[PDB]
Amino acid sequence: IVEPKFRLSLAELLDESKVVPISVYGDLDVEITGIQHDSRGVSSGDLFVCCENEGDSVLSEADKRGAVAVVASKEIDIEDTLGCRALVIVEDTEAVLAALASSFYRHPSKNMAVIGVTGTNGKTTTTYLIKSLYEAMGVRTGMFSTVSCYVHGDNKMDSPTTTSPDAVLVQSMMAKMLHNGTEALVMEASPQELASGKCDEVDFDIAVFTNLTREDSDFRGTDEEYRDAEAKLFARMVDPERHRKVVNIDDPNAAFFVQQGNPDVPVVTFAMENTKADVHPLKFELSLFETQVLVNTPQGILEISSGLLGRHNIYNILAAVAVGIAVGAPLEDIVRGVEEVDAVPGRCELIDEEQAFGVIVDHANTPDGLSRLLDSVRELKPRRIITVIGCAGENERGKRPVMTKIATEKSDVTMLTSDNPGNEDPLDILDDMLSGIGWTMQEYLKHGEHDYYPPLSNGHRLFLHDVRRVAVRCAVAMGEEGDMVVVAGKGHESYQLEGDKKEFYDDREECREALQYVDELHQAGIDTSEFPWRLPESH
Amino acid sequence: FARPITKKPTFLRLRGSFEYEIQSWKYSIPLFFTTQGFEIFRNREISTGAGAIREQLADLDLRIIIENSLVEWKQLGEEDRKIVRRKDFLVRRMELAKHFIRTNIEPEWMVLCLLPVLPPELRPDI
Amino acid sequence: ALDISYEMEAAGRFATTFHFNCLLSVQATCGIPEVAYATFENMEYGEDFMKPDTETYNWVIQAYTRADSYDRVQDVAELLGMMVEDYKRVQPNVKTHALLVECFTKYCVVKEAIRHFRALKNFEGGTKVLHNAGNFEDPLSLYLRALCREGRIVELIDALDAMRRDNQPIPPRAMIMSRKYRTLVSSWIEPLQEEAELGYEIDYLARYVEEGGLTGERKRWVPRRGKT
Amino acid sequence: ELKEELEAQGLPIDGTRNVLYQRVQKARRINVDELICRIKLHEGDT
Amino acid sequence: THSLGYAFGSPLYDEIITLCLDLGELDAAIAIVADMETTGITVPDQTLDKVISARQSNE
RNA sequence: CCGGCGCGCG
DNA sequence: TCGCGTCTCTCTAAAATTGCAGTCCCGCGCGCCGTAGGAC
DNA sequence: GTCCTAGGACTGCAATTTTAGAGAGACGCGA
């Protein structure tokens, strides 16, 4: 990958962004080599923007790392504190934060076709399906997703471990892609990022709407504001020739989104139950390893044999079909783009090792997402459901028992572990898991001593272990014909948190290793069926 | 020694102290469980030497010891040399267990982690 | 006080049971029973005017039953026997039976605590003195708990009658809630340590919320190394 | 005398022939008052 | 039990009335439904039918 | 300025 | 078609030797001898 | 020559060593 170099004077930056400063100190002709709002990312010669929630310590650290000009919303005594050559005072740093980034990188969104996707799910899935579809058309495309970022093809980007990239990061990342020859791009237009102004200075061509549901509990707003948060994506729909509307009709909020912006913009719709939409599937078959869906489009009826699991990823398939119909893509490339995607990273990435079952990974660490995923596993027809889950520490203490409650009531045998214990002891969390069923770690450990585990009140079995390692090892070893084993809570990232050190641990690779050597443990006379293991020489 | 501690969960059915090394535990389980994580959970199902004894002493629940000894003594009584000698062990054990509760002594101090050294001027053999 | 008593005996006025009781009133709270027992031994094997009375036995028993470490049940039992052998000259009061009930409760000598609680019932106040205003781990609550745990339900009912007659509300420590969310009301019937049917599913989420799991004040039921 | 083994378990069915054998071999998988009152105690009666 | 402010499940009210009918204690069954109306707690419809049948069977 | 062995005295 | 003493172990309650642990006056005087081992 | 230099006598008592005591699952003979 090639790193583009940017050189612009401070005077040209303000005029391009049309920002009116409150007052100007120092030199206006200073060359700026970059824009950073975080102290830990400031390089020598770059421009620094100070937030209102960050104290004076951030300014001093930025100056040490090589800050030359600081853009702050309030006056700061620079003659005795900062070594910067210039200080800029603006009314709203957060709004100008996107404004400064866009002009510095010459507004890269103008030279690439940006397709916007919004919704409570499939933000990563839609982007990858579109990218390795636009690629079926021969157009270079990249990734702007929480899971991972790609310039084009297979060149992944070392994305920082943050779920919401800032406006400057988006502008800087896009400029790097366009410099490497990128022609199309799809971004995750999450409600948090659209409302906060992290996507105000990005030109969007096509907007995709999948589903609007009250699922994000971290959203600091009401239902109307949450609806209006995603409404900003479609409120920019002005040009009919350049822009297309992609809205799901099955969602009740369809009528609200379709009225935003210029009504003359073409509207492409996808839904399963509602046949009035342009795109609607006709017959679908679900299996443990592949999905066959027969869809109808205005350009023709398509037969799809995709490896995606369940029906939650069908909308992402439909969205790619809907966008393909929107851009008038030939139906031949639509088949290739959808069928190419088999296991989206960080989202149900199936671990296939020629077994009679499947192992997928989901990043769901919230009760709603986990509940939806476990419900979606049921429709895939599993003979027996096995789940492995946990919860973090020092945080989210209020709803530990609900995840294991839904796991026990939905899965037959559920191993228990932690997600990221942190400084908090994992044993306390694992005891908090049993609180939702009527057990405690004291009682459960009393069960373990007498080597017998009577099942639950509904015939379901329950086993537990402190560390996720042996737990997922046993869960993999207990995959059987028609059964499904679930590991969740980590997803796209590959880090482990114990105490304060962030250990490097990947769930997908460990599941691969477990499925690699499942045979020898079971064939050597060990009754790996359930705890305790009946060793040949232990009776 | 199999199952040295109880306050942490296990997944094996090895009980007592198997004199012979377990064939599976020598090659199979370490190969399947690799090395790092295996050693991380190694000293929780099988251990040996004074470390296992110290782990057993550290996680003892003395009150449970007293109650089990008392109930076993009553069971023996409600029923003649070793029928009495087992009783005297039970009386001795619950007497021994009681003294740890009221004092500040810990039963794991009977296994040494550090070795104090006599001052040199007292050893101008030792 | 000790210096002034030494000077008084140097001036020619020997200490009597009154001065010794005054001294014992402070020695009984030092946490070391041996000081109060040395004073008691000085009193017991001395002159007629130095002989212990009910207050002296009460002070020494209180010193022994509230010791910091080691077991003192044998010492309290021998002191009780010595007081019994002195019956022609000494008789108990409410504090004697309160202290003895507390001692025989904390050491799980339940039947002796029942005997002395029957003796204590005849005194007004009674269980109010035993309650100790909640101090010293609330011996009345511990007595009620000891009665409940061993299934001495008739004696528990008698203790409740005594508390009702003494206008003594049952303290929260006596009404501690068991693991299955039960209390002394239903803890001795044939289903032991298990819940009844109740006609529906138990709302474990509500239990987790009400126990402080939202603010991390929950009491985890996991074994832990230590003599606690 | 294999019928004596039945007392170690709950004796499910059994009785005719070979059922006792199969069960024993498969059980290892789980592995005047009017005169009495005329006496009287005197505890506590000094 | 209800004076403390509680409210049992519906099935238990069915089973306690069923047992009383089998034992021949109709006076208790009419009493279990007499205070139930005053307390305001709902009573199952099928439980109403069987107790009505019992009082119609003895007349 | 430490311990063993041997021989003695009261 | 089972039933019957019973072949071959089978596991433990109850003595019966049996191998440590511990101990075996006090106080004085004198002499001798250590402190070893190996390739230089 | 040497300068560093690495097997009493008695008592007390728990520990093996039986001795025994019953006792049972599979069984060759047998009714």
Short mmCIF file of C-alpha atoms in Angstrom, two decimals, chain B residues 4 11 19 23 27 60 63 66 75 80 113 126:
data_model
loop_
_atom_site.label_atom_id
_atom_site.label_comp_id
_atom_site.label_asym_id
_atom_site.label_seq_id
_atom_site.Cartn_x
_atom_site.Cartn_y
_atom_site.Cartn_z
CA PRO B 4 -5.32 -31.08 44.31
CA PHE B 11 -13.19 -31.56 33.96
CA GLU B 19 1.30 -44.12 41.18
CA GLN B 23 -0.45 -42.35 29.47
CA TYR B 27 1.22 -37.14 25.38
CA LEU B 60 -9.09 -26.35 53.04
CA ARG B 63 -15.50 -25.70 59.33
CA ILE B 66 -15.11 -30.15 61.65
CA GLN B 75 -22.18 -42.48 62.55
CA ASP B 80 -13.57 -53.32 68.75
CA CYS B 113 8.17 -21.15 50.67
CA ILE B 126 25.26 -25.70 60.07
#
